[PDB]
Amino acid sequence: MLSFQYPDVYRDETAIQDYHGHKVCDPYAWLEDPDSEQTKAFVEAQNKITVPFLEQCPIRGLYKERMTELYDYPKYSCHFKKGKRYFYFYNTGLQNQRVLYVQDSLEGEARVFLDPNILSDDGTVALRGYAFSEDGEYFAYGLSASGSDWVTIKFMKVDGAKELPDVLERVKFSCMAWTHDGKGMFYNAYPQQDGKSDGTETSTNLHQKLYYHVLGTDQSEDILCAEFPDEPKWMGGAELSDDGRYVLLSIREGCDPVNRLWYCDLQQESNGITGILKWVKLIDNFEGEYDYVTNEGTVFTFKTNRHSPNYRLINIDFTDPEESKWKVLVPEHEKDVLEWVACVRSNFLVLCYLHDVKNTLQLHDLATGALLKIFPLEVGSVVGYSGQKKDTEIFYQFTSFLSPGIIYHCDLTKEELEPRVFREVTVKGIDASDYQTVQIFYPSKDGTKIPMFIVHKKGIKLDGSHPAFLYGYGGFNISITPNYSVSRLIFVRHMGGVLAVANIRGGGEYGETWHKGGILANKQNCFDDFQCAAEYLIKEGYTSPKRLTINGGSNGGLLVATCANQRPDLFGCVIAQVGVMDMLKFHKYTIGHAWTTDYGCSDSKQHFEWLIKYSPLHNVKLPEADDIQYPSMLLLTADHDDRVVPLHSLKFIATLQYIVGRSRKQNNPLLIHVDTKAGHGAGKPTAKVIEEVSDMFAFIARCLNIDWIP
Ligand SMILES: *C(=N)[C@@H]1CCCN1C(=O)[C@@H]1C[C@H](N=[N+]=N)CN1C(=O)CCCc1ccccc1
Numbered sequence: 001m002l003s004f005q006y007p008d009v010y011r012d013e014t015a016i017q018d019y020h021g022h023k024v025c026d027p028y029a030w031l032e033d034p035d036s037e038q039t040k041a042f043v044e045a046q047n048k049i050t051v052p053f054l055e056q057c058p059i060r061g062l063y064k065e066r067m068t069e070l071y072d073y074p075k076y077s078c079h080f081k082k083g084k085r086y087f088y089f090y091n092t093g094l095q096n097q098r099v100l101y102v103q104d105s106l107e108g109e110a111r112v113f114l115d116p117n118i119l120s121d122d123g124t125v126a127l128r129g130y131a132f133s134e135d136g137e138y139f140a141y142g143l144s145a146s147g148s149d150w151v152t153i154k155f156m157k158v159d160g161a162k163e164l165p166d167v168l169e170r171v172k173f174s175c176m177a178w179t180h181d182g183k184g185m186f187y188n189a190y191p192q193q194d195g196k197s198d199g200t201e202t203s204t205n206l207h208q209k210l211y212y213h214v215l216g217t218d219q220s221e222d223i224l225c226a227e228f229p230d231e232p233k234w235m236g237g238a239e240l241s242d243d244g245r246y247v248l249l250s251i252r253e254g255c256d257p258v259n260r261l262w263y264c265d266l267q268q269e270s271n272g273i274t275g276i277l278k279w280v281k282l283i284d285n286f287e288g289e290y291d292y293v294t295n296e297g298t299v300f301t302f303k304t305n306r307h308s309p310n311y312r313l314i315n316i317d318f319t320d321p322e323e324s325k326w327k328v329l330v331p332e333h334e335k336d337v338l339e340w341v342a343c344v345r346s347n348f349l350v351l352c353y354l355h356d357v358k359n360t361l362q363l364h365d366l367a368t369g370a371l372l373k374i375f376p377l378e379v380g381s382v383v384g385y386s387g388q389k390k391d392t393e394i395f396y397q398f399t400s401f402l403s404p405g406i407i408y409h410c411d412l413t414k415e416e417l418e419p420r421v422f423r424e425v426t427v428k429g430i431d432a433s434d435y436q437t438v439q440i441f442y443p444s445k446d447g448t449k450i451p452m453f454i455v456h457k458k459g460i461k462l463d464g465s466h467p468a469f470l471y472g473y474g475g476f477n478i479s480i481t482p483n484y485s486v487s488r489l490i491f492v493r494h495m496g497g498v499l500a501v502a503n504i505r506g507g508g509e510y511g512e513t514w515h516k517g518g519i520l521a522n523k524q525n526c527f528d529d530f531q532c533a534a535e536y537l538i539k540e541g542y543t544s545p546k547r548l549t550i551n552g553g554s555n556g557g558l559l560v561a562t563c564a565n566q567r568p569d570l571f572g573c574v575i576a577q578v579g580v581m582d583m584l585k586f587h588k589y590t591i592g593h594a595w596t597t598d599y600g601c602s603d604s605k606q607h608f609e610w611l612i613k614y615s616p617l618h619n620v621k622l623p624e625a626d627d628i629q630y631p632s633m634l635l636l637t638a639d640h641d642d643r644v645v646p647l648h649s650l651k652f653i654a655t656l657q658y659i660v661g662r663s664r665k666q667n668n669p670l671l672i673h674v675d676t677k678a679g680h681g682a683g684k685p686t687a688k689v690i691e692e693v694s695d696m697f698a699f700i701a702r703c704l705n706i707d708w709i710p
Helices: 037-055 058-070 486-495 511-516 524-539 555-566 592-599 605-614 647-661 686-704
Strands: 016-019 022-025 080-082 085-091 099-103 110-114 125-132 138-145 151-157 162-171 176-178 184-189 209-214 223-226 235-240 246-252 260-265 280-283 290-296 299-304 312-317 327-330 337-344 348-355 358-365 371-375 381-386 393-399 406-411 420-424 435-443 449-457 468-471 498-502 548-553 573-577 632-638 670-675
Touching: 022 605, 037 647, 037 670, 037 686, 058 486, 058 686, 125 151, 125 176, 138 176, 162 184, 176 235, 184 235, 209 235, 223 235, 246 290, 290 337, 299 337, 312 337, 348 381, 358 381, 435 524, 449 486, 449 524, 468 524, 486 498, 486 686, 498 524, 524 548, 524 555, 524 605, 548 555, 548 686, 555 573, 555 632, 573 686, 632 647, 632 686, 647 670, 670 686
Parallel strands: 468 498, 468 548, 548 573, 573 632, 632 670
Antiparallel strands: 016 022, 080 085, 085 099, 099 110, 125 138, 138 151, 151 162, 176 184, 184 209, 209 223, 235 246, 246 260, 260 280, 290 299, 299 312, 312 327, 337 348, 348 358, 358 371, 381 393, 393 406, 406 420, 435 449, 449 498
């Protein structure tokens, strides 16, 4: 089957670093330079063997045609009102980018407001962040090119969709918040740096500042409002209170759900916004999260995890701010996670809970916190919502493994509330009643019960004969909840497969305790949990090791790469997307310094000793047993992935090919594909999305010799 040769790749045998007395060789360190002729030649040579392997069998074409047909359905966001008009996103089906529409009423004709498709031939310029002025008459929006986190902010006047001259550069990981006087907007920017800032560089991002842009002026006139020169990793994001009186600054350092919270009463500024604001440091530590919900005068409602790992709502009065005085508006639940909270129609709160990895949605009274109404949902997720304090209605969007989505609407001015379907689209070709979703709880190595969803055709025999696709992430307080994927349903219907999603530790599914269960010294729990999910699918007869594919992205790419090293005998195929592979060096590049809150950092002997045991780059080893080889592996990355710099996948694949690929017993391929004009994944155009899933499933099909089922 292996009709290609791995390219020759130079090994710098002098690249040796001492980590606390432990010598580490890094012979492909040179791949860390994305601009070198050597690195460019490496990427070209890798793509030269991967692309023909993916495209050789008719299966890829068959999958691509089916994906193109089935993904071609209308895709809507929730409506949201801004000022006197309503807005929503819509894709007729296969547009590269969804388009923002405007209408003057719910019954009125809609027209195009902003169409990102016309900004590039290939759909590689995408919206990334936006903010309307408080009155809805002005609009700021971020644009990212080629999938980079870097943003350029532009402005429009809403009436007539008039382009304005204002352009803001050096924007990344930025807030966007207009003052209610309509004068200007807060945003974040990084200082100038040597070399490129286009998403191909690896330069660390430090000293982010908070600026205020006055509309109608040049960016060079912008006011510096906050900076942290003694704390280069701090990031201060601004928002205005609902009444426009206060700027609230949420300062983060790293990725944990915690923030400092400072406020500025704008009425107390001596002469408007003219420099560093008179910040009052309400919460001046990183011990808890304080997420603004609403305020009534000086009484501020926050969602918090302060001594409340499943989250709760508290009221802090700025005039009586000591912690002993805070009021608990909605107490923490014993098990269910309060995921997010919004305030709507002055005095309602909408709370969204996660109950065993499924969403519920409730309306509560702002004054007492009392439950008023349950909004009924099917089993799945709430993935969009609109309804601000001054608005009198809500929209929310529901999705599940088997259903594309339903947008609901509820008019909250009505005495008796009555949520109604507002938009619903069905995908023809995927009959949902042919399948089922089950939730099981399996024990991990240490006895902890882990949730797992399994999606399969009704009535299958559990005889181990079915290909399976097992997905996980496990980190960063991210909950992996039910979502509609046409790409995975094609694997089910046309490849006879079983889908599985394991809610392993590190995630947010059981609150901060679940998250802490999969970080730092305990990161190995994630891998144990995921290997145990694979063992469950096998033991219960859903699949067998030779038919099992695992997949994850970013932190999930780390997950599957580590699992391939630790239990190569458990998996037939591994697809690692945009994965963190070098655990000793990740903190050196772009925003990787922020991930030390989940991983630790190799500058500490204690942390190094954790990291070295599981770092994918540092644990590639020929299996000892003669009858065991590595699974077939595909790494997917892209040359503007400035979130997880692609040198992670480059160094890993060079290592896999040299250590394992050279062995006579290894016949499963170990390949990388590096895309162009793409990044970590956000904003990827439809065309590239289709190519990517076609690559993934063609790889699975060829490696496992799976027949298409038309
Ligand atoms: C992929 N999972 C990468 C590598 C490991 C962590 N990664 C992230 O992208 C993390 C996790 C969250 N993403 N998701 N899902 C967010 N994130 C970031 O790096 C966000 C960077 C910007 C930032 C940094 C610190 C505080 C707030 C925002």
